[PDB]
Design a protein around this ligand. Structure first.
Ligand SMILES: OC[C@H]1O[C@@H](O[C@H]2[C@H](O)[C@H](O)[C@H](O)O[C@@H]2CO)[C@@H](O)[C@@H](O)[C@@H]1O
Ligand SMILES: OC[C@H]1O[C@@H](O[C@H]2[C@H](O)[C@H](O)[C@H](O)O[C@@H]2CO)[C@@H](O)[C@@H](O)[C@@H]1O
Lengths: 314, 323
């Protein structure tokens, strides 16, 4: 299994953004992080957390051609690719709340309905990932309230294996590394490393014990922090202190994360969050509140970490 | 206790729910008194005084209650006293609704406590303040029964918290406790032993009632508790009888006969069985439409519709009046 030096590209997955002349320049600029991987991330959509139907590849979401382009462009840039189709909820609910009754009842949509819709979604992109030679497929992201549906997840993974021959991971949410009973069904364990400033040493200890109990490769499928006042205390909170710029907060987050998670032989690195298809101008970086590190001191932390000899050795 | 709640805390319920959704301005109108009086002509001996509390979303921990536009404690004392002045026994039914429109059965939190999310512990503390406020009001006003929840499906697996809440309720409220499970869920609640009386929402489709009588009879016999319907009803709308629970189905498409048929079937299969303790019907508004408007009204309400006559002949029939 490769050590991942990664940046996520393309989120939220807007066809008009991905087809702009600006998208190619954005992906080229991302290579200056000294990454060898990118996660091509884009959304699918369902109306509510309790509705069974997932829409994908319809305006304003990415076309299959947009996706083929992003994968081919990344690979042309010498990057290995994780394809990362993510379901979002149109009403704004966090996808971790997607959930149905344990008991099938005639008056409600069922797990079986939602899983059929999720299978259509994920198998569509699994076939794309096969056709385009994606090195890895991420079959879900922080789907916390679905994870107890163990038979349905294992049945989905078996269908994925029949159409996709690359590496499979599932991205569990922050704090959830020990809560997935079906890690054995994927190749590589992964989680969202949005752990607050001051907690990384504790989480390195906690996660090491989980990964050694499973004896499987682990890496962070997401990790990052907005360049905002006190974002480092809640790096996952994309709504905290919008417009309140703090470059140094984001830098401190990255320096601590890499102090504790580096070269350990059980650890396979970082897919960072994230890098837009339409990138702001360098001159606007110092006033930008995004997760993106472009033009910010955290980018230099990432570059020196990814080019350092201990990490270049993995 | 089993088939009979302990003496210190079973009647056959002939009930109609009153006051929903629980708007202070509606309850304080002159019309509220006339509405409740008119309800007694159903030959009911019980009413459920039903009103909402609110939380923002299905995944937020804070419940607001007794703030505009919701019912004041004085509005509630009034409805309970008026009902009792009319000879009715009272079920107090505080119900949590979600401001964003989400069905309360989806109210839910992560099984694992995590630093980044609201916890079950936070929601149960807010739910306890809500339900203990009304449990104390039920005690002060002498309500015969308290319903401690309604179709909270995605909370029901939290057995320790539900049993802990019920023990706190027992400390402030000495009457009969019921919990109203959702349609189809009668066998899915693991803590029925902690309440006095089992109850469900009887919104079963036309053509299914014989089947549900058999299904429910076996569930009730396995628990050895009294059972009744804490809700049951059907809108007077085209094809409502196929989905009696669906308050959004075919609005403004009037069908008096569909509601009538629903009631006739329900009473054909659920009547006088000794394990069964009757019906709290859904529902009756604080502000009642005029009789002359009844034939054009699409609500659950039976006032001025053929279904009212099915209900009255059922509730006054000697078989039922002797329970
Ligand atoms: O879901 C849309 C928002 O995503 C945000 O990034 C999230 C993302 O959902 C992801 O899957 C993860 O687990 O947490 C990330 C960091 O908060 C932002 O990109 C935001 O702008 C989007 O609206
Ligand atoms: O919740 C507001 C709506 O309630 C409806 O009646 C429901 C009610 O929520 C109840 O607890 C139950 O289990 O089902 C009832 C019948 O659908 C209607 O009164 C509707 O008008 C309200 O908007």
């Amino acid at each position: 299994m490769d050590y991942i030096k990664g940046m996520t590209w393309g989120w939220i997955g807007n066809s008009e953004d991905w087809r702009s002349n600006e998208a190619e320049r954005s992906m080229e600029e991302m290579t200056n992080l000294a990454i060898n991987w990118t996660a091509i991330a884009f959304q699918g959509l369902q109306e509510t957390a309790h509705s069974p139907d997932i829409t994908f590849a319809e305006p304003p979401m990415v076309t299959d051609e947009n996706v083929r382009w992003a994968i081919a462009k990344a690979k042309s840039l010498g990057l290995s690719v994780i394809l990362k189709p993510i379901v979002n909820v149109r009403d704004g609910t966090w996808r971790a709340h997607i959930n149905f009754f344990d008991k099938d009842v005639p008056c409600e949509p069922t797990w079986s309905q939602w899983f059929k819709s999720y299978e259509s979604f994920m198998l569509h992109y699994a076939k794309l990932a096969e056709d385009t030679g994606c090195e890895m497929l991420c079959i879900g992201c922080a789907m916390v309230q679905t994870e107890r549906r163990e038979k349905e997840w294992r049945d989905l993974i078996q269908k994925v294996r029949q159409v996709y021959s690359g590496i499979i991971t599932y991205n569990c949410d922050k704090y959830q590394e020990d809560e997935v009973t079906w890690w054995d069904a994927v190749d590589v364990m992964s989680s969202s490393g949005y752990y607050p400033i001051g907690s990384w040493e504790h989480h390195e200890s906690r996660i090491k014990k989980i990964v050694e109990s499973w004896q499987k490769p682990f890496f962070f499928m997401e990790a990052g922090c907005p360049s905002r006042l006190e974002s480092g205390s809640v790096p996952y909170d994309w709504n905290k202190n919008r417009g309140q710029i703090d470059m140094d907060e984001q830098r401190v987050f990255y320096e601590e994360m890499f102090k504790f998670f580096h070269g350990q032989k059980w650890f396979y690195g970082f897919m960072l969050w994230d890098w837009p298809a339409k990138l702001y101008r360098l001159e606007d970086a110092s006033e930008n509140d995004d997760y993106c590190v472009y033009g910010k001191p955290a980018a230099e932390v990432i570059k020196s970490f990814f080019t350092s000899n201990k990490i270049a050795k993995r």
